[PDB]
């Protein structure tokens, strides 16, 4: 009843296996993986965005110098100039000709746009993956269970209880350093907090949008106003966050192999088809029925009808059933050569019922198990010319 | 599927060909040539009369 089985990690591929429960009628299983969310553990480092040089009003003493003070503003650049003669609309501003001094100061403050648009640095750990599994086994034909991958957690939705994982591959598309920009994910190597070079990425680094303190290395340097005019000419490197926005690499959600996609989320990488899962499930004995009730289908034979050497269910075959009583009968092929989309067939008195399947061998010689009745369906297949189908469901490529 | 086939250039004959695309039932096709006009390119030279 406790059917342990390793399962390939695919999303849209069934796992219709058969339970070889002694003393009772065998019961088919069926497992599907809707999602394979990874959700690695993450730790935010800092957020960067365009900055705004909030330059306050200059201090202009008409006759006399004025020493500046080292204010605690981030990247607070202050410098005093000498020998200035500012004009304004109302005429010349002072009667002195050399004692005029200007005290110009400027500091970098994060732009108002940071509230909505801002990159996010992230350092990630291994984390723990989760999956949504649908199991339509036996006669219940339904399940809607969210499960983990750790090799301890039971999942007991409906009547059956089972345990999943751990994954065979520790492959994580995320790197140790991950940069998230609004909706797309880039595995860019942000240097560290409080060390960004001016002009490059992370010129302005804030711990959090709420955090008041930040790290603004913009190489801001004021210069003398020209021709006696009241303003604050400041020379600084162009916004580093503006750069790398128009020349960033391909997002990780567009270069991650194994068909894995990401989202603005706990950063799960869903549908990351890789490795296998050691699935173990405990079927309740209630679903089991006495073996003495299943009709006998011995002395039957299998005939191939038309097999296509393709990926979709192009293979069909007719089975000449030789039964005694009437009832349901699970069908399954223990061999991985062929996969049968058909799940249950009712048996009449010496009837014949076609079924569909798919295979990957030119001359498929696969065992067919029919409610405790073995038969080999040997035949021939033909490759298709119009290779236009859904994604392959045979998942059995090997030597042919 | 793309049933490529050479058939004789005749008028009164069905070209009963089967389409054996795997996965589906074969279907027959009938082809007949009612007309075989050639219509070569021409260029008027001149006109003569009594």
UniProtKB/Swiss-Prot annotation, chain A:
Known partners and oligomeric status: The precursor of protein E3/E2 and E1 form a heterodimer shortly after synthesis. Processing of the precursor of protein E3/E2 into E2 and E3 results in a heterodimer of the spike glycoproteins E2 and E1. Spike at virion surface are constituted of three E2-E1 heterodimers. After target cell attachment and endocytosis, E1 change conformation to form homotrimers. Interacts with 6K protein.
Annotated region described as E1 fusion peptide loop, given as residue ranges: 84-101
Carbohydrate attachment residues: 134
Function statement: Class II viral fusion protein. Fusion activity is inactive as long as E1 is bound to E2 in mature virion. After virus attachment to target cell and endocytosis, acidification of the endosome would induce dissociation of E1/E2 heterodimer and concomitant trimerization of the E1 subunits. This E1 trimer is fusion active, and promotes release of viral nucleocapsid in cytoplasm after endosome and viral membrane fusion. Efficient fusion requires the presence of cholesterol and sphingolipid in the target membrane.
Protein name listed in UniProt: Spike glycoprotein E1
Residues of the full protein shown: 802 to 1201 of 1242
Post-translational modification: N-glycosylated.
Extracellular-side positions: 1-400
Domain of life: Viruses
Compartment annotation: Virion membrane; Host cell membrane
Natural source organism: Eastern equine encephalitis virus (strain Florida 91-469)
SS bond partners: 49-114, 62-94, 63-96, 68-78, 260-272, 302-377, 307-381, 329-371
Lipid bilayer topology: Single-pass type I membrane protein
């Amino acid at each position: 009843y406790e059917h342990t089985a390793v399962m390939p990690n695919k999303v849209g591929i069934p796992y219709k296996a058969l339970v070889e429960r002694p003393g009772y009628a065998p019961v088919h299983l069926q497992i599907q993986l809707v999602n394979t969310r990874i959700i690695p553990s993450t730790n935010l480092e800092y957020i960067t965005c365009k900055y705004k040089t909030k330059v306050p009003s200059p201090v202009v003493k008409c006759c006399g110098a004025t020493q500046c003070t080292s204010k605690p503003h981030p990247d607070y650049q202050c410098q005093v100039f000498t020998g200035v003669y500012p004009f304004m609309w109302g005429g010349a501003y002072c009667f002195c000709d050399t004692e005029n001094t200007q005290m110009s100061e400027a500091y970098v403050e994060r732009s108002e746009e940071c509230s909505i648009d801002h990159a996010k640095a992230y350092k990630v750990h291994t984390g723990t993956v989760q999956a949504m599994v649908n199991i339509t086994y036996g006669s219940v034909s339904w399940r809607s269970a969210d499960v983990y991958v750790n090799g301890e957690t039971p999942a007991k939705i409906g009547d059956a209880k089972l345990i999943i994982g751990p994954l065979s591959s520790a492959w994580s598309p995320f790197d140790n350093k991950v940069v998230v920009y609004g909706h797309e994910v880039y595995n860019y190597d942000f240097p560290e907090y409080g060390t960004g070079k001016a002009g490059s990425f992370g010129d302005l680094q804030s711990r959090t949008s709420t955090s008041n303190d930040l790290y603004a290395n913009t190489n801001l340097k004021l210069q003398r106003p020209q021709a006696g005019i009241v303003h604050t000419p400041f020379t600084q490197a162009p916004s580093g966050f503006e750069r790398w926005k128009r020349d960033k690499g391909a997002p990780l959600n567009d270069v991650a192999p194994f068909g894995c996609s990401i989202a603005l989320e706990p950063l799960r990488a869903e549908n990351c088809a890789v490795g296998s899962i050691p699935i173990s499930i405990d079927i309740p004995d209630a679903a089991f029925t006495r073996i003495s009730e299943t009709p006998t289908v011995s002395d039957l034979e299998c005939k191939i009808t038309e097999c296509t050497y393709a990926s979709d269910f192009g293979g069909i075959a007719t089975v000449a059933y030789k039964s005694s009583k009437a009832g349901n009968c699970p069908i399954h092929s223990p061999s991985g050569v062929a996969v049968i989309k058909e799940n249950d067939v009712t048996l009449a008195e010496s009837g014949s019922f076609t079924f569909h399947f798919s295979t990957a061998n030119i001359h498929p010689a696969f065992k067919l198990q029919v409610c405790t009745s073995a038969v080999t369906c040997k035949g021939d297949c033909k490759p298709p010319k119009d290779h236009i189908v859904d994604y392959p469901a045979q998942h059995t490529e090997s030597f042919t």
